[PDB]
């Protein structure tokens, strides 16, 4: 079977390699804003707060591997 895949999963691990620079392997307000900051201007703290609150359903503002595995997989049927 397709036991040894490592096709798409290789790109998930890349997130904790290109997105985070602290060596934590988690997505917080810091990594969420740093990319936008050098992509299309950084929003206000309030806007950033709401953004991480709109993703972190656990209530800590941090996404680990187990969370990321579901976050970057449960795509909606509608595209923005």
């Amino acid at each position: 079977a397709d036991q040894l895949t490592e096709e798409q999963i290789a790109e998930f691990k890349e997130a904790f390699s290109l997105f985070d620079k602290d060596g934590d392997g988690t997505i917080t307000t810091k990594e969420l804003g740093t990319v936008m900051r050098s992509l299309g201007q950084n929003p206000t703290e309030a806007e950033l707060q709401d953004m991480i609150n709109e993703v972190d359903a656990d209530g800590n503002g941090t996404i680990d591997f187990p969370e990321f595995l579901t976050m970057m997989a449960r795509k909606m049927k509608d595209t923005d």
Binding site: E11, L18, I27, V35, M36, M71
Partner: peptide
């Protein structure tokens, strides 16, 4: 939504992975 604004930076990551 964050679930879209998250995929966006990831798309940038994909671009970096290519570049």
């Amino acid at each position: 939504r964050a679930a879209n604004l998250w995929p966006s930076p990831l798309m940038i990551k994909r671009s970096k992975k290519n570049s």
